[PDB]
Amino acid sequence: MSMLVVVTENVPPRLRGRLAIWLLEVRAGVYVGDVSAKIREMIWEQIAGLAEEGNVVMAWATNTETGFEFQTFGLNRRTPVDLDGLRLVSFLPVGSS
Amino acid sequence: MSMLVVVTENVPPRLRGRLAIWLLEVRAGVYVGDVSAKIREMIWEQIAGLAEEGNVVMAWATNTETGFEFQTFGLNRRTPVDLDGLRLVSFLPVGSSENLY
Amino acid sequence: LPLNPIPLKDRVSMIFLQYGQIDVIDGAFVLIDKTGIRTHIPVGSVACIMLEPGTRVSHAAVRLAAQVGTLLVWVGEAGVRVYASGQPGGARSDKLLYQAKLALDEDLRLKVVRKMFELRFGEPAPARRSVEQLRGIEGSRVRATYALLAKQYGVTWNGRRYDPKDDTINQCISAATSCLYGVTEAAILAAGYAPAIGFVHTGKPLSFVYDIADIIKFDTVVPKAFEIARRNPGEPDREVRLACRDIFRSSKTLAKLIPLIEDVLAAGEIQPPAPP
Amino acid sequence: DRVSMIFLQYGQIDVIDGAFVLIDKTGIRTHIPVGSVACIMLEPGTRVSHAAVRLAAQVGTLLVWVGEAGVRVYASGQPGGARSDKLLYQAKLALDEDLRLKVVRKMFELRFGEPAPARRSVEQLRGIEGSRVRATYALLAKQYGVTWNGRGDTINQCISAATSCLYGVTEAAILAAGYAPAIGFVHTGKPLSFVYDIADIIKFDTVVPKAFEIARRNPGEPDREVRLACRDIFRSSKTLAKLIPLIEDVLAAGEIQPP
Amino acid sequence: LPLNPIPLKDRVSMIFLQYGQIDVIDGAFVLIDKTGIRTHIPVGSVACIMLEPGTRVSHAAVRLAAQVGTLLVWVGEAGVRVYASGQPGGARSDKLLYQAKLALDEDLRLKVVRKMFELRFGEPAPARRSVEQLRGIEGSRVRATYALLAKQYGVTWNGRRYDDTINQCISAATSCLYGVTEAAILAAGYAPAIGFVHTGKPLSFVYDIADIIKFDTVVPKAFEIARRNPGEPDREVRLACRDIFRSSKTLAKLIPLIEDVLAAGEIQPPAPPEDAQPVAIPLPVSLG
Amino acid sequence: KDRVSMIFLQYGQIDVIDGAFVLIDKTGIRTHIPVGSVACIMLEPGTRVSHAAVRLAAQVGTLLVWVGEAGVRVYASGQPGGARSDKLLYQAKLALDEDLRLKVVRKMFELRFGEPAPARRSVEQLRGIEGSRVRATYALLAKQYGVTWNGRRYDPKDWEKGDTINQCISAATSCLYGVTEAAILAAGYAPAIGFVHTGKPLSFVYDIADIIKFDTVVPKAFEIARRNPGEPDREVRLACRDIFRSSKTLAKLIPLIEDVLAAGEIQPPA
């Protein structure tokens, strides 16, 4: 078990309802809990299946060197990258150059 | 050290710039890191002082029954509450509910 | 797409609600107090929710709790079970008829009781004994264990009183036992079996709950009740609640309940229902 | 004993002076005679107090949470059955082959309007029933003047809606009697097999014909209209009060004395 | 609300960047590649950022890094420090003059050098030896340690040289330590050019401090990697050092080590800064 | 080679092309820079420096300093803390010895007063005269350029002195402070080790700036304040750049610093 945080943006009420079933909603669209890897993977399936044209990011604590992992979904999502074992993030410009 | 997550909304560019100094911006307005209680407390100090209009939530991993803690700042912020040692959340009735009660 | 209940072991064991009303506001299971404050409760991550006197429940709350496999338990004096709601019965008839066949046949039933006896006392029961005889022997062992815990914790003992009409220690035991009964009923229901069909206890709506819970109650739950009664503190029930929650989590009771139910029934040596 | 079942909707449920009271949206209060009712079916919009739940448990009245007009059963009081004596009675019948056959033949005897000849095998009874079920639908189609191509189109949609309401109230009745919905005889292997068993016996009396009546008018929203029609049927035509006696009569076929 | 650099202890020790242009785009420190892809790097949570050849730097990048107390280190082939940028110098004159007073007085200098000797070898140096004598004694032990390690890990050894595989691993490993050490000295407010054992060089004090803990952590790892003889030695060396720095809490130890070394002059050190601590985060509410 | 020249670089990309240090623009036009001839290169916002350009600067011993527009402030420095230990210890020795420190302090006051001032006065007496001299010089410049003057703003709480002239003076002085610090850094000295002004991170910068402050920089502030501008800070920074371009102000900074420290009569390193 490790800390799990899910942040949604412009997702249908369906997904928000499902997340509120298992995770604590500390703010509209922000869900947090302490769950196992198996449950986390279930949560991601709920996200991948119910989100549509909406933006989601899910982050959880790991014993890795960076200390956390994350994955994104939907419109204009950012890309998780690895730099020499360190977890960073890459993304495209907003019309720049 | 434990995982820290900061989510901002309608926050001035000053705070977002500061948060991007120490934490990883996995999404615009969402910052993640692995920092100590000391660093956590100073980041919260930045939040309380740099955002006055916007809405902020900070959550961090702990060795408790619930497994995490959180705090909020800004308009319509929800309050972290304790029920028999369990961490839950309380909030006011929302006006834009589109559903009466 | 479909909504599936998560395993009980992956949930908070119990939450006690004392006042207010539970409902579903804007797609969120909440607790609403008299002042209008909404408190979000992730219903799907709780094994069972306990409702104390003065608590109201809406149709939407009862519905959602059943859909997520969260047993709602109405609680009275000292945490005693007044009522419960959830999904009706066991969806699989094979599991029901299996449990029923084991309980109706006296030979199969006898094969289940000794298994219960062996698992509870950590040793085989004396051979060639009837269910009634085993019941008397079990009762004798129980009184002995009660007296031993009393001397060990320095609590004065005058016997076990199941009815509150007859002290401090007996109140702690009932409150602690009710906690175990609550999560046990939830486990039995989640496994697809009937809490009404027992082997040692019979005829009562929660006979199988009493059978399963009594096997492991002295291991952890009951002795902690004696520890609380030793301090003799204010709010003895509430302190027992927290203590049982810690016990359930540290011992992983909800995880162990499933194999316990299965092993107990397997003792009849009838081929069990095929998974899933 | 008591075999009546009632619907409660849109109100607060509490206990005053020891009385079971429903308080509507408006201030109008209604006193419910618990203790003389076998089951209370709670519809969306109802809010039950702790005291009301407690009182229902004392008098032995089962609380069942259902959708509008009993479209579905979401939750039940005393889940996993309250009465073990009744549950084990039903189980015993299904276990012994000789006993369950007596229940099956009794069911076919009730589907027919007369006792079936002893030489008839179970497989033949299904063939006979299947033919007169098919003939019943066709007869109902001719009566109400609807296009029929077999049991989709508007008519099948109305039938499904009508039976689903009956399936709900039937399940709640089975639960109120302390039996298991999953333990069926004619129909087996499904969570609501016993429900199908009992409902199939009485569905062609008022419920299914009502579906043909509504389907004839060709409504834009057939589901809502059918549910309301079934709601009135359950309200006036005492079909609810005949569910439990039917269930008991069916299981009485096994020569074993009832609990 | 002022922007204050966090302790090096609470940071990633080092990050190597080999291509693109570091910049600050939309208020975020990023690495931009030739296609325009930006990679966010929380600069304030990094102690050293190493810049390999082919990497371009923008004004905003250098500015922000200095403001958050993150040393930028230009690195050549392979691992060798070419340049570095940061805050112009020590903000406190009393610290600079304290370090200079110790280095300018030959008596005070010798006392400091002896402490460095004792910390490095776990025992006090022979009595009444000059600085140049301690240097000879030090050099004798270092050659022995190099030889001792080369036999334990089974690596061919012809001595240490600063210009085959083992010597490249050692220099690459030591360069990681030097970068991190230079950052610690700057963060402490001292001058990395004012040394005690090493003198006259732009990084004399860096060599002084690093050589003390060099053989305990960094150097023996360079031998462990050299014997395996990997495809990319210097890259595997860098990752190894980062693991050791984290495991041994190197960053956290450096500043107290620096102070302890300077304190050996028996001159009263300048007073620590007045700590203005951020208040604790509001507690949860009961009876919720 | 002992160089004293300093230059600015702005709004361009910097790289080594064919062994040459060049500044390329947005159009692709490239200007050549005599890096081996300058002591310090001041990088203004908008500059981008390649790895090769940084390497070449280090080789020829030309210090790279990152500054704001027109040197309004110093954000970062190449070789932070100092690369030249011989200069630092030279500055440190002068500050550590009371006798040597006094000789430097008095020399600074001589350069401020513009006279040898052979009369033996205490340091406190020297500060008093300077305080009067500065106040008079401020008023004299206002009298010269016909500017309304109510005194220099030394307190941010003093709102009354928050006029146009004080804003122009602050902007001009900021530019002088930046190029002064860069000159100190290029000479291998520490900005925090001051003599007249002490206890501040830029104490030595203040000492050097206070000597040449009223020569060209501050008078220019009054000149711009004469014709009330909409954006004073902008026009002042531009005018200061023109002073740093036209006049030999930047070239005189390093020798001034050396001359000041040479008053300790201790032989400078070589």
Beta-strand pair F6-9/F40-43:
parallel
Strand-pairing partners, residue B31, are B6, B25
B56 and E267 Cβ atoms separated by less than 8 Å: no
Burial grade of B3 (CB within 10 A; 0-12, 13-18, 19 or more): buried
Q: Residues 29-68, chain B: which have Cβ within 8 Å of C?
A: 65
Whether B20 and E45 lie within 8 Å, measured CB to CB: no
Record: contact D65-C59, CB cut-off 8 A: yes
| Secondary structure string (H, E, C) spanning D106-153 | HHHHHHCCCCCCCCCCHHHHHHHHHHHHHHHHHHHHHHHCCCCCCCCC
Q: Which of chain C's residues have a Cβ under 8 Å away from the Cβ of D83?
A: 196, 205
Please name the member of A26, A72, A80 whose beta carbon is closest to the beta carbon of B70. A26
Q: Which residue of C has its CA nearest to A26?
A: C40
Total domains present in chain A:
1
Is B82 touching C (CB cutoff 8 A)? no
Task: Pull the structure tokens for residue E43.
Answer: 């600069």
Tell which of B27, B34, B55 to mutate to test the A interface (max A CBs under 10 Å): B27
Task: Tell me which residue in B1, B24, B78 faces A26 most closely, judged by beta carbons.
Answer: B78
User: Is chain B adjacent to chain C, meaning 3+ CB pairs within 8 angstroms?
Assistant: yes
Closest-CA residue in chain C for A25?
A: C40
Flag whether residue C40 sits within 8 Å of chain A, measured between CB atoms.
Answer: yes
User: What gap in Å lies between CA B93 and CA B48, rounded to an integer?
Assistant: 24
Subunits next to B (3 or more Cβ pairs <8 Å) are A, C, E
Taking the CA of residue A33 and the nearest CA in chain C, the distance in Å comes to 9
Side chain identity, residue B64 = T
**Per-residue three-class SS string for chain C:** CCCCCCCHHHCEEEEEECCEEEEEECCEEEEECCCCCEEECCHHHEEEEEECCCEEEEHHHHHHHHHCCCEEEEECHHHCEEEEEECCCCCCHHHHHHHHHHHHCHHHHHHHHHHHHHHHHCCCCCCCCCHHHHHHHHHHHHHHHHHHHHHHHCCCCCCCCCCCCCCHHHHHHHHHHHHHHHHHHHHHHHHCCCCCCCCCCCCCCCHHHHHHHHHHHHHHHHHHHHHHHHHCCCCHHHHHHHHHHHHHHHHCHHHHHHHHHHHHHHCCCCCCCCCC
Q: Does B10 contact chain E (CB < 8 Å)?
A: no
The SS3 of residue D205 is: coil
- Tokens 């970068």 label which residue? E179
Buried/exposed code over D72-99 (b: 16+ C-beta within 10 A; e: otherwise)? ebbbbbbbbbbbbebbbbbbbbbbeeeb
How many beta carbons lie within 10 A of that of residue C93, not counting itself? 25
- Enter the DSSP assignment of F143: H
Q: Is residue F2 exposed (0-12), middle (13-18) or buried (19+ Cβ within 10 Å)?
A: exposed
The CA distance from D95 to D81, in Å, is 18
φ, ψ of residue C122 in degrees (nearest 5): 70, 25
Closest chain B residue by Cα to residue C249: B65
Rounded Cα–Cα distance for residues C186 and C70 (Å)? 8
H or E element, residue D160 = helix D154-176
In order of start, what are the domains of chain E with their CATH numbers? 1-90 (3.100.10.20), 91-288 (1.20.120.920)
Of the partner residues B26, B60, B66, the one whose CB lies closest to the CB of residue A89: B26
Verify whether the Cβ–Cβ distance B5 to A5 is below 8 Å: yes
| Closest chain D residue to the Cα of C186, Cα to Cα | D79
D255 exposure class (CB count in 10 Å sphere: 0-12, 13-18, 19+): exposed
**Residues of F comprising the binding site?**
130, 197, 210
C28 with A35: Cβ contact below 8 A: no
Residue A86 sits at the chain E interface (C-beta within 8 Å):
yes
- Return the SS3 of E97: helix
CB atoms within 10 A of CB B52: 12
State this model's resolution in angstroms: 2.3
Residue C11: CB partners within 8 Å, gap ≥ 6?
C44, C45, C46, C47, C70, C254
Bin E66: left if φ > 0, else alpha if -120 < ψ < 50, else beta: alpha
DSSP, collapsed to helix, strand or coil, labels residue E128 as: coil
Taking CB atoms and an 8 Å limit, are A84 and E238 in contact across chains? yes
Q: What are phi and psi of D214, to 5 degrees?
A: -75, -40
Across the beta sheet with A2-9, what order do the strands follow?
A24-27, A30-35, A2-9, A55-61, A68-73
CB atoms E36 and A84 under 8 Å: no
Contact (CB, 8 A) for D186 and D112: no
CA E240 to chain centre: 15
Q: Identify the bridge partners of residue A6 per DSSP, sorted by sequence position.
A: A31, A58
Q: How far apart are the first and last CA of chain B?
A: 43
Question: Do at least 3 CB pairs under 8 Å connect F with A?
Answer: no
The alpha-carbon gap from E191 to the nearest alpha carbon of chain B, in Å, equals 26
Contacts of residue D257, defined as CB under 8 A and 6 or more positions apart, other chains included, come to: none
Q: Give the C-alpha separation, C224 to C234, whole Å.
A: 16
Q: Give me the residue from C62, C85, C96 closest to D180, CB to CB.
A: C96
DSSP state for residue F71 in the 8-state scheme: G
Taking an 8 Å cut-off on Cβ atoms, the answer to whether E59 and F43 are in contact is yes
State the burial class of residue D258 (Cβ atoms within 10 Å of its Cβ: 0-12, 13-18, 19+).
Answer: exposed
In Å, how far is E40's CA from the nearest CA of chain A? 6
Radius of gyration of chain B (CA): 15
- Tell me which long-range contacts F16-20 makes (C-beta under 8 A, separation of at least 24): F16/F50, F16/F52, F16/F53, F16/F55, F16/F56
What value, to the nearest 5°, has the Cα angle with vertex B18 and ends B15 and B21?
150
Pairs across E and F, CB distance < 8 A? 159
Method used experimentally: X-ray
Question: Using CB atoms, which residue from A81, A85, A89 is nearest to E239?
Answer: A85
CA neighbours within 13 Å on the CB side: how many for F131? 8
Is E164 annotated in some ligand binding site? no
Distance of alpha carbon E162 from alpha carbon E177, whole angstroms? 16
> Is C201 assigned to a binding site?
yes
How close is the nearest chain B Cα to the Cα of C230, in Å?
A: 22
Alpha-carbon distances of E253 from C267, E184, E191, E247, F166, rounded to whole Å:
62, 9, 18, 12, 48
Residue written as token pair 């992956």: C10
Q: Which of B65, B83, B90 sits opposite C38 (nearest CB)?
A: B90
Nearest CA in chain A to E30: A90
Chains with 3+ CB–CB pairs under 8 A to E are: A, B, F
Measure CB to CB from residue F96 to each of E91, E92, E100 and give the nearest one: E100
Among residues E148, E149, E201, which one has the least CA distance to residue E178? Answer: E201
What are the E-state strand segments in chain B? 2-9, 24-27, 30-35, 55-61, 68-74, 79-83, 86-91
Helix (H) or strand (E) holding A72, with range, is strand A68-73
Chains sharing 3 or more CB pairs under 8 A with chain D: C
Contact B17 E28 (CB under 8 A): yes
Neighbours of chain A (3+ CB pairs under 8 A): B, C, E
Count the alpha carbons within 13 Å of F252 in the hemisphere toward its beta carbon.
Answer: 15
Provide, as residue numbers in chain C, all residues whose Cβ is less than 8 Å from the Cβ of A28: none
| Residue in D with minimal Cα distance to C17 | D50
- Confirm if A46 and A35 have CB atoms less than 8 A apart: no
Structural domain boundaries enclosing B25: 1-101
